[PDB]
PDB file of C-alpha atoms in Angstrom:
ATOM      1  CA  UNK E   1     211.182  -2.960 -10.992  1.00 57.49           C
ATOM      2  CA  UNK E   2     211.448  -3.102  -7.007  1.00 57.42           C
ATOM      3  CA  UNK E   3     212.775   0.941  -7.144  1.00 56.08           C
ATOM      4  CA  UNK E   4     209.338   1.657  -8.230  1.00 56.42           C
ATOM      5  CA  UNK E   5     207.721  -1.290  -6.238  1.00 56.41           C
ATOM      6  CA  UNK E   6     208.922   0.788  -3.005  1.00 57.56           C
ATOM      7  CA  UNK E   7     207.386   3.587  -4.137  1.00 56.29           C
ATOM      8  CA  UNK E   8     204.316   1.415  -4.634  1.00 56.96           C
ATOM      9  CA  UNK E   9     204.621   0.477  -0.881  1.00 54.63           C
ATOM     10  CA  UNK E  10     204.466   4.399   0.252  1.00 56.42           C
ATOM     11  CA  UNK E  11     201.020   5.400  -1.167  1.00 58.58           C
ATOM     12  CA  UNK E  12     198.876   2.632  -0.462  1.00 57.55           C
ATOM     13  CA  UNK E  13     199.707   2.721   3.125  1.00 61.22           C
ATOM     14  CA  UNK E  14     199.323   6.422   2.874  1.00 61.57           C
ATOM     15  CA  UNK E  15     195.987   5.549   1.133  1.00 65.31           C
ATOM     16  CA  UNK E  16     194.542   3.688   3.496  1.00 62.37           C
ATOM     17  CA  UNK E  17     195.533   5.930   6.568  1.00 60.36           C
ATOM     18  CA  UNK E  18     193.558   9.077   6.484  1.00 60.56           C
ATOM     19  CA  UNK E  19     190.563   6.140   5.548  1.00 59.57           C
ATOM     20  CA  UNK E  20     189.235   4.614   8.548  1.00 58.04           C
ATOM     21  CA  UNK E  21     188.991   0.988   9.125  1.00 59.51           C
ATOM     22  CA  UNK E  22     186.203  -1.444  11.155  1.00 61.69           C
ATOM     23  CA  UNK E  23     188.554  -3.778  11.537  1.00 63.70           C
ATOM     24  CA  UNK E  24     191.987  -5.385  10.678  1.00 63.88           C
ATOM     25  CA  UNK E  25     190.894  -8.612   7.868  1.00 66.42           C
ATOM     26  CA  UNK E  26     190.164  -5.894   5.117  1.00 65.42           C
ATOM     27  CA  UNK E  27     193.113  -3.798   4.978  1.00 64.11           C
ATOM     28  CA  UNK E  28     195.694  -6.699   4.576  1.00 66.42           C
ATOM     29  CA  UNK E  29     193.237  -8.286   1.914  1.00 65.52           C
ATOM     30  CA  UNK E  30     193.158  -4.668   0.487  1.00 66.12           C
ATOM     31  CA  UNK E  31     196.494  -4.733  -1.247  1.00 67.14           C
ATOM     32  CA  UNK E  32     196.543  -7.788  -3.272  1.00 68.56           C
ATOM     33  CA  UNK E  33     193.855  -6.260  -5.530  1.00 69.02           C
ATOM     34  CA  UNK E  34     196.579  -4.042  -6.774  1.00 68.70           C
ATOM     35  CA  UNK E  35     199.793  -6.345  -6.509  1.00 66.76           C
ATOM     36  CA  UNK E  36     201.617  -7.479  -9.592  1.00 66.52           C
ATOM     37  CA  UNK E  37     200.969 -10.409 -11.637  1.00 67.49           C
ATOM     38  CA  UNK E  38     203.596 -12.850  -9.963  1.00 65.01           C
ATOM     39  CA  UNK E  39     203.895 -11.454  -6.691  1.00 66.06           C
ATOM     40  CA  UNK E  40     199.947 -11.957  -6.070  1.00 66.24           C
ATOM     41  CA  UNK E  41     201.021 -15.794  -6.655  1.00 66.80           C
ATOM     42  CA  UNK E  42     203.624 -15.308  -3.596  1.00 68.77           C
ATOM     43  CA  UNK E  43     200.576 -13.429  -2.127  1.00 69.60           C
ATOM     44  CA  UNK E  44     198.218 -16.043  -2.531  1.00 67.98           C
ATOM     45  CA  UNK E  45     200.343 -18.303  -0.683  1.00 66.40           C
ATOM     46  CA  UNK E  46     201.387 -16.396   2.263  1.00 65.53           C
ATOM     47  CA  UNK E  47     198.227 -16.084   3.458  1.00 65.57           C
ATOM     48  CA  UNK E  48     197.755 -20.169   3.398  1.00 63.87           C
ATOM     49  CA  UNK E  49     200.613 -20.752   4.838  1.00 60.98           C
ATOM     50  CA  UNK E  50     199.492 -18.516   8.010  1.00 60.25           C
ATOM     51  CA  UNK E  51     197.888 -21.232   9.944  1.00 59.02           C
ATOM     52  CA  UNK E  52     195.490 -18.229  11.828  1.00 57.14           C
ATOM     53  CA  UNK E  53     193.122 -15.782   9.969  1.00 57.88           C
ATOM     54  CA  UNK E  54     196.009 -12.892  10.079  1.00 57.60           C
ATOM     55  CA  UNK E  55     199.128 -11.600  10.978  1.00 55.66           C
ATOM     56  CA  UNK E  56     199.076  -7.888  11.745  1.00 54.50           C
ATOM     57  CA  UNK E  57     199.381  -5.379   8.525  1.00 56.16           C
ATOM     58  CA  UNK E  58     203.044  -4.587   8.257  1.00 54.54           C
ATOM     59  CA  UNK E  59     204.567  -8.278   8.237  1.00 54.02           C
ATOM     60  CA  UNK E  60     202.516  -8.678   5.018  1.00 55.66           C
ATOM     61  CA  UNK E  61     204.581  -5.918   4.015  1.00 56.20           C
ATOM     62  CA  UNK E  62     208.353  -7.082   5.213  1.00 57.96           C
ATOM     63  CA  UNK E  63     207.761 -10.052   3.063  1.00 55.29           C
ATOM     64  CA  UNK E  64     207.113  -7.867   0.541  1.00 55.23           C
ATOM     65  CA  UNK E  65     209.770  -6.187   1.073  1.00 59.28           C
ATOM     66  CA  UNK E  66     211.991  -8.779   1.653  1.00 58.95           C
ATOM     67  CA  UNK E  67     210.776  -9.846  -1.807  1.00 60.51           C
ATOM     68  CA  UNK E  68     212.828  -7.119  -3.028  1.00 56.62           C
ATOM     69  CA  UNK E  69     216.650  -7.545  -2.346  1.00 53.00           C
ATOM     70  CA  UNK E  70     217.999  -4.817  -4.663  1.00 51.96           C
ATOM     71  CA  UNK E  71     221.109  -2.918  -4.190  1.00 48.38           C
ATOM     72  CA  UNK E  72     222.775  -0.610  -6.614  1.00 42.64           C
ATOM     73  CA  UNK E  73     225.947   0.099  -7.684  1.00 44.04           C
ATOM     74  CA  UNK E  74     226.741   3.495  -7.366  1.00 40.59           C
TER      75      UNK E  74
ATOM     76  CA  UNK V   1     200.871 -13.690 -27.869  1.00 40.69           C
ATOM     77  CA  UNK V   2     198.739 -16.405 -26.038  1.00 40.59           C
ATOM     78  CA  UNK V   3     202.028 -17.440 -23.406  1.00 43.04           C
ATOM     79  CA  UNK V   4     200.734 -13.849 -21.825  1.00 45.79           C
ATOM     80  CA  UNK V   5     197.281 -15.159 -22.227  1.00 48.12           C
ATOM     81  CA  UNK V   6     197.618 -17.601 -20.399  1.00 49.27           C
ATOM     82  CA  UNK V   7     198.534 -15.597 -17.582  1.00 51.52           C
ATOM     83  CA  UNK V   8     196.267 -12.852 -17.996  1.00 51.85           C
ATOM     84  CA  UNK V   9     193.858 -15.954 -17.531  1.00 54.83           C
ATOM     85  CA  UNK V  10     195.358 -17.056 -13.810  1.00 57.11           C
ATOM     86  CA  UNK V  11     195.019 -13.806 -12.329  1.00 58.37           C
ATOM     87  CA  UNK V  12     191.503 -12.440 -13.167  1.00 62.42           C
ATOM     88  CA  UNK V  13     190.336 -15.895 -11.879  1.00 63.22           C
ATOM     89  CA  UNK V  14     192.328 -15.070  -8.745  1.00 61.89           C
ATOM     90  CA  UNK V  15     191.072 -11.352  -8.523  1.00 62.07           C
ATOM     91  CA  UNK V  16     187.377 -12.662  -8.611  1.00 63.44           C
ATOM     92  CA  UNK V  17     188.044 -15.755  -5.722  1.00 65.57           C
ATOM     93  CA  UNK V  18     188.847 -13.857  -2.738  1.00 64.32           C
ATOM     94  CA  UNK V  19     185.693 -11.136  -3.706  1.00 65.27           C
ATOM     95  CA  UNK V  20     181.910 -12.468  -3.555  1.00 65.54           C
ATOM     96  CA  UNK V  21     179.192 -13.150  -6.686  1.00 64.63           C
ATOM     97  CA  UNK V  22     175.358 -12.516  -5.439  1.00 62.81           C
ATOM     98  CA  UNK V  23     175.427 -14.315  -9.213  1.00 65.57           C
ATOM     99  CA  UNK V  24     176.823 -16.051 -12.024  1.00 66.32           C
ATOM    100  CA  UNK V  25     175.870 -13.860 -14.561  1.00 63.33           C
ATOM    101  CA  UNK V  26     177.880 -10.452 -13.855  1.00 63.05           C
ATOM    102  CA  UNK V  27     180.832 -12.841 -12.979  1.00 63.49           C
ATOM    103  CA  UNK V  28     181.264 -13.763 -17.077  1.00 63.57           C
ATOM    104  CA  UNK V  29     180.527 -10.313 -18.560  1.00 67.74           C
ATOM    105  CA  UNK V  30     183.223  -9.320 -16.329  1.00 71.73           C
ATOM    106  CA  UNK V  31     185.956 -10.944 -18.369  1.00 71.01           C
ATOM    107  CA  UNK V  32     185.304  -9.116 -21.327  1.00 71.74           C
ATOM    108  CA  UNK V  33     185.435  -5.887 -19.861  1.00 71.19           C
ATOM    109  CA  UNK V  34     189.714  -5.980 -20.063  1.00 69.82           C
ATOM    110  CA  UNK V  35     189.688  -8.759 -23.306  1.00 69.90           C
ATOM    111  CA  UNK V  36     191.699  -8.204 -26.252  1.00 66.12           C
ATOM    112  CA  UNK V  37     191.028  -6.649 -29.427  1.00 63.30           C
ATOM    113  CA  UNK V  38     189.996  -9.396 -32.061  1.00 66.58           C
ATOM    114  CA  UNK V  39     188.583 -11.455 -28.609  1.00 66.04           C
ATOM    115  CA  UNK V  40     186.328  -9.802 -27.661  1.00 69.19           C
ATOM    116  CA  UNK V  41     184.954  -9.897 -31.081  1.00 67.33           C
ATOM    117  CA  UNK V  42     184.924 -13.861 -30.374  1.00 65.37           C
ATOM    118  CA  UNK V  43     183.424 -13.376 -26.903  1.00 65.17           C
ATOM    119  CA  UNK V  44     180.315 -10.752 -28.590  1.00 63.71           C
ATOM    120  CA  UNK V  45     179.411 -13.415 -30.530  1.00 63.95           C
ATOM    121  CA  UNK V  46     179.847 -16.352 -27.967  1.00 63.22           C
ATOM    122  CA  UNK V  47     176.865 -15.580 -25.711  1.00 64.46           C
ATOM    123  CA  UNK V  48     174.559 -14.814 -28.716  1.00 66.78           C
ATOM    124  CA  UNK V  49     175.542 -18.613 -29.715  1.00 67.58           C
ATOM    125  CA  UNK V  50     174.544 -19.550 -26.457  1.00 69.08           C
ATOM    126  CA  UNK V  51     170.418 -19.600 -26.399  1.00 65.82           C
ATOM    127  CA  UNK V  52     170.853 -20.169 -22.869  1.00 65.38           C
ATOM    128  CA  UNK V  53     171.667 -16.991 -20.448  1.00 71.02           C
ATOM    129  CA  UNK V  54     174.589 -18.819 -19.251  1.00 72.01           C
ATOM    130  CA  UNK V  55     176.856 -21.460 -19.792  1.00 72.50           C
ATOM    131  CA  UNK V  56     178.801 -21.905 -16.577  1.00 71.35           C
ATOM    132  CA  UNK V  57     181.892 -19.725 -15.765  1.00 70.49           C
ATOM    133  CA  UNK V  58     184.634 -22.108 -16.845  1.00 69.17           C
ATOM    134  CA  UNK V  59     183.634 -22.665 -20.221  1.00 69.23           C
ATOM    135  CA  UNK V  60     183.433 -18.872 -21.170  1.00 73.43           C
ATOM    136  CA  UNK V  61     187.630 -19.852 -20.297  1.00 73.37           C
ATOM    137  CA  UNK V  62     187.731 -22.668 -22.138  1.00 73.45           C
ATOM    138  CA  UNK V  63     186.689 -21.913 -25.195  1.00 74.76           C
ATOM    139  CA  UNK V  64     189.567 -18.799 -25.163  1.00 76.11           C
ATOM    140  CA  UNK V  65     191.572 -21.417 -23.857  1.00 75.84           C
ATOM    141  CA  UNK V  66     190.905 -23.590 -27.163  1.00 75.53           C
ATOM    142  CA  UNK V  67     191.421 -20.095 -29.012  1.00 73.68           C
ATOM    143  CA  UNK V  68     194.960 -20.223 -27.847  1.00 75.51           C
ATOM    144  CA  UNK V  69     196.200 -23.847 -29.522  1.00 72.16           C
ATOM    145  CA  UNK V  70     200.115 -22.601 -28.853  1.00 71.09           C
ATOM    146  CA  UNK V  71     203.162 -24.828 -28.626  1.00 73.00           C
ATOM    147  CA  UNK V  72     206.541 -24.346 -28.369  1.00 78.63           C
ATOM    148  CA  UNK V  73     209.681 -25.805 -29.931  1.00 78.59           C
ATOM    149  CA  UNK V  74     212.172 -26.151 -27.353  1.00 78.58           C
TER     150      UNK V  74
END
């Protein structure tokens, strides 16, 4: 699953570059409207339990990808 | 069946909160737009039942929620 959900972290940042932006509120709210079905439930919640309106793009992200934790074998 | 269906209610709920409604109306023919085969069928004929335009959002869930009656064993 996470293999391809790194993948899925590449493009959408990559979509949203080249795009212009008015401000910061959009772009983090942006990505949850193509999350999966149980990490949007781990998405709902991290933005409650940020007291303030946001913090900045990428830490969205690291949690995200600290949702991951995969190794392989070989 | 329905255990996904219950589910595939949570998050299409969640996918409409965070985005705005100038109505109620387009909010409830939404749903159907990504229902199920023989559902859909169900949801054609459950506006025509209604002689009202509307019966409020919930109960369009509701009454696919009563169409799931699904318990388990263990």
């Amino acid at each position: 699953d996470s293999h391809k959900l790194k993948n899925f972290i590449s493009e959408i940042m990559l979509n949203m570059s080249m795009i212009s932006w008015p401000n910061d509120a959009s772009r983090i709210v942006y990505c949850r409207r193509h999350l999966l079905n149980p990490a949007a439930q781990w998405a709902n919640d991290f933005v409650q339990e940020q007291g303030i309106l946001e913090i900045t793009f990428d830490t969205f992200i690291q949690g995200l990808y600290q949702h991951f934790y995969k190794p392989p074998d070989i």
